[model samples]
Target: HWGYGKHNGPEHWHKDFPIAKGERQSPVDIDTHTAKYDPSLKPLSVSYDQATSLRILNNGHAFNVEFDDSQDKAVLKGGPLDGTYRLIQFHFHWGSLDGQGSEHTVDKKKYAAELHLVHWNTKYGDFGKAVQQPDGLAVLGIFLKVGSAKPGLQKVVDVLDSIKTKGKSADFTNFDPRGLLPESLDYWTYPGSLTTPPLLECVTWIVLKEPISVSSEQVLKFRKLNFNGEGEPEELMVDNWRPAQPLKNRQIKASFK
Candidate 1:
């Protein structure tokens, strides 16, 4: 029932998801001036076994690539996290056009899009069990800019036309997600909630300082996805990002100076 539309969007989510008004909501602005460098923060490390790549789908919210996470074959460790978190899925949030789409901004600057790699703490046994815990999830966010066409991104774009509507999915395997990451691992970490509902405040946000590139043509491919299901109104899936919420009492810590 919750979506990015005016009637059922982020602002209206509070009725069904009370935590929408929570103190540690996500997608906060990354103000470098206020973000202090923390020497204790370690470099973020990710080990993704490409064979675990499963499929891609559109769930009426955003198109996400699911992974085979029955084990720790694809996992993330180090950084602000305390234990190993297995990569379960990844998704992108974007706008109908360029210039304003990224959820987290740097000094109030928005990127064309944002990619989120979601992982769950293995200590909790299951993603369902882990999601309720305070330290259950870690999301790595990478901002995307409009520039040269990226071959890695084109792999995903090539499949977009297949899943243009909600509940649509296609086999997408043997793809390495590492190809999408920026060169720099420097990041800003904070305690935050899911950008979407139930808006659970369980994620440890590790937002990369550098952004990757996606050409204008690639941006159009993503916009072709639909927020509405087949046979319903054809609403393009764009600007699906949640507005940046207040930082409140949380502190933004940087891994690099």
Candidate 2:
């Protein structure tokens, strides 16, 4: 049932997780020329108060946090798509013990990691139901590389010590997921399926072109995540990322205007 490493690598994900067949997969090559590019698309502003009630969850795949909707509102609150879309969950995709771990590629090069900020349209009610709709989900893709320090991400990485084991999580109160987002909100948008199983083709992916940095040591700590179930001792799980898939004629648009 575990979905990491060679035994359950991305290539064999669909077999174990049948839902993977329908999910909107990511980590595709970012080809700017194929889709509309707009540089002027405004970066939606988010306030600290709106992002403070984050609840971290260990969903067995990776560590994800659910944002509280009662205390916050979405950016551009009164716009056309105006509504309180709660942050449902966020997870990461990474490679095995070696190599890069990002879900998306740039000019065919892979990075150390990628973070996904998953939110759902509150207009449709809870996230469980909203996921049934094609436009129900909004995922912000943030790239992580091994390099200089990243202050924003350090906040999350610092807590890895408490949740280093699988199915182990702690209260990540008052944490703002938005802080992890890249400064440039301009993104590459596309219609795709979920990178996870039940690969529903219902995701509006906003992949950030600019990558954030994390120290090599921090990355090494992340690789320490154990996938050998929750009860096993001396368990070391390496690699939890899915590989890149075919584009399937999908048009990837960017906020370039």
Candidate 1 residue pairs that clash: none
Q: Model 2, which residues run further than 4 Å from truth?
A: 16-24, 38-48, 74-84, 96-99
Model 2 Cα lDDT, one tens digit per residue, 1-257: 64665675677877766756543466578866676765544555444355654555556677776566653453322111345456666778766543577878876778878888777777787777777888777777888877787776677777877776667768887776666766676677777767776567667777778888778777777777766556677455456667777777676766664
Best by TM-score: 1
User: lDDT of candidate 2 vs native?
Assistant: 0.68
Report the number of clashing residue pairs per model.
0, 25
Could you give me the TM-score of model 2 versus the true structure?
0.85
lDDT of 1: 0.90
Candidate 1 residue-wise lDDT, 116-207, digit = tens: 99999999999998889999999999999998887888899999989989999999988889889888898999999889988898999999
**Per-model TM-score on C-alpha atoms:** 0.98, 0.85
Q: Which stretches of candidate 1 lie over 4 Å from their true place?
A: none
